[PDB]
């Protein structure tokens, strides 16, 4: 995010970082359960990618987090790789996450809920702070 | 480098699809939701993360970072997957697995 600010660590406890095999960040995702993560379909997640939970900083020689293996990926069959429509994917953990003050789930809406134009919402991530 | 080692946040307003097409036109489909153009923007590496809004005192996932300004302009809206249009699929998948 460009023009955002640093979060209080632990304050967005559902936020996860997806890491490839080399081992570095290629997308974020969100915990909905101790067993599942929602992310975008275009991220191209595979079973060799790893989910990282409880993480604040990316340069620690070592920090206290949770690296979770992926058992199966559920891309939405409606996903259109040209149009980018129906951009969601579910990740089924092969080892439930261990909820705590820093790792927990976000709530999911209903299909009939209304989120009106004008609502002040919040987005988080580790993407670039400047193009 | 321009990547943050520390988790970043930002507040941004939701837009109507009506409004978002002013910018993106036809690229905007029913299963998409735009936010921003207010001086902040999701940018490379933010893909797949959440766009949450507070309902009944709890944060609810409304969007998933999907695409946006090829230059991450703060004047242009970010496009998110509309969770409301995809939730029946989530829940059903959850129900069977």
């Amino acid at each position: 995010i460009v023009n955002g600010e640093e979060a209080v660590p632990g304050s967005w406890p559902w936020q996860v970082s997806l890491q490839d095999k080399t081992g570095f960040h290629f997308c974020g995702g969100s915990l909905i359960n101790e067993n599942w993560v929602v992310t975008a379909a275009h991220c191209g997640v595979t079973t060799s990618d790893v989910v990282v939970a409880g993480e604040f900083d990316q340069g620690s020689s070592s920090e206290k987090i949770q690296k979770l293996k992926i058992a199966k990926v559920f891309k939405n069959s409606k996903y259109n790789s040209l149009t980018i429509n129906n951009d969601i994917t579910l990740l089924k953990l092969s080892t439930a996450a261990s909820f705590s003050q820093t790792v927990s789930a976000v709530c999911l809406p209903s299909a009939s809920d209304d989120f009106a134009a004008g609502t002040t919402c919040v987005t988080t991530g580790w993407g670039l702070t400047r193009y | 480098a321009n990547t943050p080692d520390r988790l970043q946040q930002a507040s941004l307003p939701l837009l109507s699809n009506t409004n978002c097409k002013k910018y993106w036109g036809t690229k905007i489909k029913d299963a998409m939701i735009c936010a921003g153009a207010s001086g902040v923007s999701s940018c490379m590496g933010d893909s797949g993360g959440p766009l949450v809004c507070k309902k009944n005192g709890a944060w609810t996932l409304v969007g998933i970072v999907s695409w946006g300004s090829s230059t991450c302009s703060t004047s242009t809206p970010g496009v998110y997957a509309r969770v409301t249009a995809l939730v029946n699929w989530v829940q059903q998948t959850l129900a069977a697995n």
Partner: peptide, 8 residues
Amino acid sequence: CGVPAIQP
């Protein structure tokens, strides 16, 4: 279900 223990 969506209430951080550490408030944002």
